[PDB]
């Protein structure tokens, strides 16, 4: 699923989601997010499952975006855990959970998580 | 905080996170879960807040880890994301997300939640 | 939103979540669920926000059910933890935690995660 | 675990979880939380595997807490779920998610995760 996964996909807030999947199991890319403490792209890194089964299962996959740039610093990052389901209508489930650094006094608090649907089309 | 996380951390299960953070806020190593269906090392990759805040917050970060590696493959990956808290008893507490491949009528049961504390010395 | 959230709601499972909204914040009525160990109706028990905000946020509110019944018995339990948001498509938008009894070595992986989005009409 | 389970719960922030387990799967009682936009106690209701199996196995059971009481409304609600271990330095062991009533644009940051440890003597 490396030429499946490769591509431009966007969620259901309007993040932009671009990826290269390598043949190694590496994911590269930039992640831009329509929400939040952000502005433009932000490096990420993952990896998925480069053998999956072939009993009609999904794909696991991850990555990561830490939300520093040159423009911004939110002192938090993200992290996505999902299967990418592949066919006519392709698509990465994903659930995430977002970190801010805390104080240990605040750190009860420092989790977000969340769920993300990645498609290849905008909605 | 490059040379406070590069190095060897250990979880409460006795899992071994082998990390080098990168001056450009990247992370790379290798994972070896004492639990699970898992053998030996696995390649990681993520992100960590290279210019945390200087107040006393911990520094954000995560890192996912893919199932697959030359002897097994569990059609799964990991995400790990959390915050790295420096000192005397430095750790890296985290929340993960463990997302297995699924078919359809089975993915609402295809992701794991947990929480794993890392310390520089073994339990 | 006592006369909102009262009633039966639909998961995109095809699970139904049958409650009364008490007065006093207490969610009560039954589940039951179209996937997994499971057969017939569950308790379920929760809490919501009977007095929410007039700024146009949601509702929060949370229920569990223990998954044993006069039928089975998965020794699991989920919590979901949500908002409703009323109007002409009413919703109630969860994020949900089953976990499971375990022995100690198996705790790691006692706890499943996910999301269910729950409508007036199935 | 009716006997077990009964009585007065202390986590890790040193919040309290005073809890009645009813032979019919009840739990009824009131939490009060040493963190947070909380003061005093609140209701709280939840279920509990009242026919747990005889292997070893833990408790499963969960509760919820919606913060409104008479002095204080935060709109908001946590539910804890997880498993009750017993024996000496009997535990409840927990994963929670707390939702904040959000508008639909900040819907993506209404839900904190984190995980609670309670047992049956105060840190």
């Given at each position: 699923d490396e030429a499946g996964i490769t591509g431009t996909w966007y969620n259901q807030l309007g993040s932009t989601f671009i990826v290269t999947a390598g043949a190694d199991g590496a994911l590269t890319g930039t992640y831009e997010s329509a929400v939040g403490n952000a502005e433009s792209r932000y490096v990420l890194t993952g990896r998925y499952?480069?053998?999956?089964?072939?009993?009609?299962s999904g794909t696991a996959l991850g990555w990561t975006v830490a939300w520093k740039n040159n423009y911004r610093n939110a002192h938090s990052a993200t992290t996505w855990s999902g299967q990418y389901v592949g066919g006519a209508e392709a698509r990465i489930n994903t659930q995430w959970l977002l970190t801010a650094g805390t104080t240990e006094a605040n750190a009860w608090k420092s989790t977000l998580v969340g769920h993300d649907t990645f498609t290849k089309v905008k909605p």
């Open positions: 499952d480069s053998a999956p089964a072939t009993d009609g």
